[PDB]
């Protein structure tokens, strides 16, 4: 078995390896800087470290068992996967992560967990898992906020450990800036140590201050560097959150830009107020019902095959229900589906009136269309979704009594979404299907009859070729006669 990196199993293992990586990245420095944290729970620490090393070994095994896309196919050969893993820097990082440095517990002592800092080199699994979650979850902004919060918590925790270690190196209680003397009943508790260090780190890394001022030169240097680092951290937080906020309302901002440009044009052109109200209502309908994006530009992002599959899935059944296109070739039907253009109509709008030019055939994807009389209050028949009209008009049939004219008034009762197939689009699709075009014209002629409606030039060119040659014969004879006449005059001279 070879684990697909794009599968759910790979994601589950990414979480299962991210847990020991986060455990190391926090608690290794936590135990290194706080000696009491390492010493008080030493058996628990040893059990967790052994478990984390086991999970690291299983992660290396998964790396040897993770396929990669070569020639578009997952590589399932074990030797190829092993060679691909060992060729990468990740193999060196994982080997350095699992160096048995724990034998230095017998040399340096049990209170030196800095030897496990090599386990931090497995950060690649943690970052890869966070990227996969960002590209996977349905709530990108919530997860991105949570991830940023976790990054800041980890950084502030590391800074707290650094501050406590600096206080330890200088000496607890030696001055006001460092952590106070740890023989105190209150400040000598490990929980108090960590919470005060975390408080100091949060104060300094979030551009707040209000810590005891530094006394020694090293403390002043560390406070300057740490406040600059906190300024960078805060600016990074603000930049990430502002980028997220800009991304959330990017669609709203661009939609408002389109509406504002339309309003600018309508105030420019002195458009009537009722038309402006209808435009505003239409844009509100687009935003409320999540119809803001146009179908053409959205489908341009998809590849030609995927766009064709999407179009087929949307329109193939309702195109096959059309009587002229019922018995047609699959490729022609696919091309006609790809040639469909959406059209959305507000309630009370007219799809076509009597006497209009019929050059397109409409498919009712959704909505209701009413066949109305001249007054518009009487309804003949209501056309529901999947219905169609104007199929005869797009067929250029000779002898039609109703040539390219609409014989009925079609009114949109509500917000009807329609797809139109123009005559030019049908002709272009039928260029590559001549027999299909001929049988389409024959079927349209049959429908019209059922419904009560409905090389001499080349031969003359050869004569014209002979006519020009015969006409040039007299011109050559005139030149010959002129030469003879001029010579006769010259001889007589």
């Amino acid at each position: 078995v070879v684990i697909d990196p794009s599968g759910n199993t790979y994601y589950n293992w990414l979480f299962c390896i991210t847990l020991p990586v986060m455990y190391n990245w926090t608690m290794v420095i936590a135990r290194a800087c706080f000696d009491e944290l390492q010493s008080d729970y030493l058996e628990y620490w040893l059990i967790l470290d052994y478990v984390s090393d086991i999970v690291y070994l299983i992660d290396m095994f998964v790396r040897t068992r993770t396929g990669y896309l070569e020639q578009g196919l997952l590589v399932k050969e074990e030797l190829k996967l092993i060679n691909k893993y060992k060729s990468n820097l990740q193999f060196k990082l994982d080997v350095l992560s699992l160096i048995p440095t724990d034998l230095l517990y017998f040399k340096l002592g049990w209170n030196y967990p800095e030897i496990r800092l090599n386990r931090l080199l497995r950060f690649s699994r943690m970052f890869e898992f966070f990227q996969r979650t960002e590209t996977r979850t349905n709530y990108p902004n919530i997860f991105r906020i949570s991830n940023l919060v976790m990054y800041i918590v980890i950084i502030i925790h590391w800074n707290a450990c650094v501050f406590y270690s600096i206080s330890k190196a200088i000496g607890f209680g030696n001055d006001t800036w460092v952590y106070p003397d740890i023989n105190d009943p209150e400040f000598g508790r490990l929980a108090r140590k960590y919470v005060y260090s975390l408080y100091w780190s949060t104060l300094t890394l979030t551009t707040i201050g209000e810590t005891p001022p530094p006394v020694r030169d090293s403390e002043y240097v560390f406070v300057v560097v740490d406040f600059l680092i906190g300024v960078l951290i805060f600016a990074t937080i603000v930049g990430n959150i502002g980028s997220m906020i800009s991304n959330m309302n990017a669609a709203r901002a661009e939609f408002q830009a389109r509406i504002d440009a339309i309003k600018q044009y309508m105030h420019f052109r002195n458009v009537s107020k009722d038309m402006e109200k209808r435009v505003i209502k239409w844009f509100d309908y687009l935003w409320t019902n999540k119809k803001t994006v146009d179908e053409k530009e959205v489908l341009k992002y998809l590849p030609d095959k995927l766009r064709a599959e999407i179009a087929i899935n949307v329109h193939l059944d309702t195109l096959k229900k059309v009587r002229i296109f019922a018995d047609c070739e699959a490729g022609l039907l696919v091309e006609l589906v790809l040639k469909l253009q959406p059209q959305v109509y507000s309630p009370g709008d007219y799809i076509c009136k009597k006497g209009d030019i019929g050059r397109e055939m409409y498919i009712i994807k959704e909505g209701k269309l009413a066949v109305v009389a001249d007054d518009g209050v009487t309804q003949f028949v209501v056309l529901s979704d999947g219905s169609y009209f104007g199929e005869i008009s797009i067929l250029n049939i000779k002898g039609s009594k109703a040539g390219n004219r609409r014989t009925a008034n079609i009114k949109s009762i509500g917000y009807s979404d329609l797809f139109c197939l123009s005559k030019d689009d049908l002709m272009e699709a039928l260029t590559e299907y001549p027999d299909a075009k001929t049988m389409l014209e024959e079927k349209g002629k049959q429908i019209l009859m059922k419904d009560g409606l409905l090389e001499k030039v080349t031969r003359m060119e050869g004569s014209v070729d002979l006519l020009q040659t015969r006409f040039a014969r007299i011109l050559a004879e005139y030149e010959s006669m002129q030469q003879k006449l001029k010579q006769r005059l010259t001889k007589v001279e």
């Binding site: 209000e210 040659t469 040039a472």
Partner: protein
């Protein structure tokens, strides 16, 4: 000047600056005189004289300068005195100037003089128009807004201190020093949320402090957002160029493009960005109005194209269409513009750089060097398709920029102009029916007669 242009008159910009200074004096000194005791009866005459000067500036603005501003009605400038006066009286700027000019000793009675803010906006528009790189002025203006907000905060803090008594508590201003820079220091530590101030004790002090920290959080957010927008807009073009360059480099690295081709592409990218400041000019050209683009194409290439003897006598609109269809291509040094023996399709106009025509024995000899403004390869335009080949090797001496018109674009232009198309076919036939049939008939008659006469004898 009997009539003054509100857009391009520097003296009007100076008068607008004077009106802005008067409005700034009013806005910055009304809360000072309302809150601080600086308006004493001993020095009240300075305040009265400068207020009278500001009111005089307002009066000569509303009555003199504003009525002589020329405006637009249906795209035409109006210089008429009565029409300008009617346009200004109809406009809302007259309404605000009338509201501000109303007098309504109390400094708060000077309040609606701050309603002449429109002149400040027109001054800002003129400053952003006259000088390029205007985001530094936007930064200065936003900093001035922050300074005025801190000024108002300082005045409010002094008012609160006087309301609660000076030195009564630690929170209020104690009463020692300049008495404006202490309250301004409070405003700085508060409206930037720096802190470090004595804590508020009473309910009024806590409410004031709370609201002033809330306003300060939002004002600091406004400052940071304005600076972020300035940084993003200032570096937007460089960011786009870097993103396009990095996308191209990533594309070449994915397809294992060798280092020579990648280096040439990077060299072209850097040279184009450093020379013309944009990767494509047609993207800018299509954004312009059609008349603007046509006039720019004329101003760039009309004399050079009309100097070409091939297109003399053609319609001027066809010349214009070729100018519109010209595309700018930058050729790297030692690049072959025309290789010997390849299909000739393109007419080249040297806008910049040099072009060397190679030849002689074994190549590598410069027969002639063509500088900017010279056109070569125009004969290849008048070809049937595949009928033209480049006679000599043509190479770019340095980074030359050629305005290029291919044969296809010329044909799509020529299908619109039948007279000039016919003239071009005539010129092409001249440089290299009835007469052909007459010569064939004469030769055929002599050939048939020769065979007939030989058989007769």
């Amino acid at each position: 000047p009997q009539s003054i242009d509100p857009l391009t008159n520097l003296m009007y910009v100076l008068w607008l600056f004077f009106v802005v200074m008067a409005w700034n004096w009013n806005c910055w000194l009304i809360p000072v005189r309302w809150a601080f005791p600086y308006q004493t009866p001993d020095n009240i005459h300075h305040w009265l004289l400068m207020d009278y000067l500001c009111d005089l500036i307002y009066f000569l603005d509303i009555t003199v300068f504003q009525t002589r501003l020329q405006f637009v009605r249906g795209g035409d400038i109006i210089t008429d005195k009565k029409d300008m006066r009617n346009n200004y009286l109809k406009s809302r700027r007259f309404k605000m100037d009338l509201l501000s000019l109303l007098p309504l000793v109390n400094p708060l009675l000077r309040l609606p003089r701050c309603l002449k803010y429109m002149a400040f906006f027109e001054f800002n528009s003129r400053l952003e128009s006259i000088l390029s790189k205007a985001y530094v002025y936007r930064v200065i203006r936003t900093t001035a807004y922050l300074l005025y907000s801190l000024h108002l905060n300082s005045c409010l803090y002094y008012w609160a201190s006087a309301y609660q008594g000076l030195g009564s508590t630690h929170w209020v201003y104690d009463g020692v020093g300049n008495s404006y820079i202490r309250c301004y220091y409070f405003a700085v530590k508060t409206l930037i949320t720096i802190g470090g101030l004595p804590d508020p004790k009473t309910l009024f002090e806590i409410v004031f402090q709370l609201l002033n920290y809330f306003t300060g959080v939002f004002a600091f957010s406004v400052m940071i957002g304005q600076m972020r927008d300035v940084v993003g807009a200032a570096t937007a073009g460089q960011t786009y160029y870097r993103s396009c360059m990095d996308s191209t480099v990533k594309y070449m690295n994915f397809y294992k493009i060798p280092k020579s081709v990648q280096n040439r592409v990077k060299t072209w990218y850097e040279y184009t960005w450093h020379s013309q400041g944009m990767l494509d000019e047609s993207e800018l050209m299509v954004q312009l109005p059609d008349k603007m683009r046509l006039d720019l194409a004329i101003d760039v290439n009309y004399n050079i194209v009309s100097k070409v003897a091939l297109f003399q006598g053609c319609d001027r609109q066809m010349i214009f269409d070729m100018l519109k269809r010209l595309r700018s291509v930058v050729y790297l040094p030692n690049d072959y513009v025309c290789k010997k023996g390849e299909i000739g399709r393109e007419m080249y106009i040297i806008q910049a750089g040099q072009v060397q025509v190679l030849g002689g024995p074994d190549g590598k000899s410069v027969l002639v060097t063509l500088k900017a403004g010279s056109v070569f390869g125009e004969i290849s335009l008048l070809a049937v398709g595949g009928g033209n080949r480049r006679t000599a090797n043509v190479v770019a001496h340095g980074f030359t920029n050629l305005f290029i018109l291919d044969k296809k674009d010329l044909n799509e232009i020529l299908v619109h102009y039948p007279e000039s198309q016919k003239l071009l076919r005539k010129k092409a036939r001249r440089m290299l029916p009835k007469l052909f049939n007459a010569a064939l008939a004469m030769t055929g008659k002599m050939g048939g007669k020769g065979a007939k006469g030989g058989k007769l004898a």
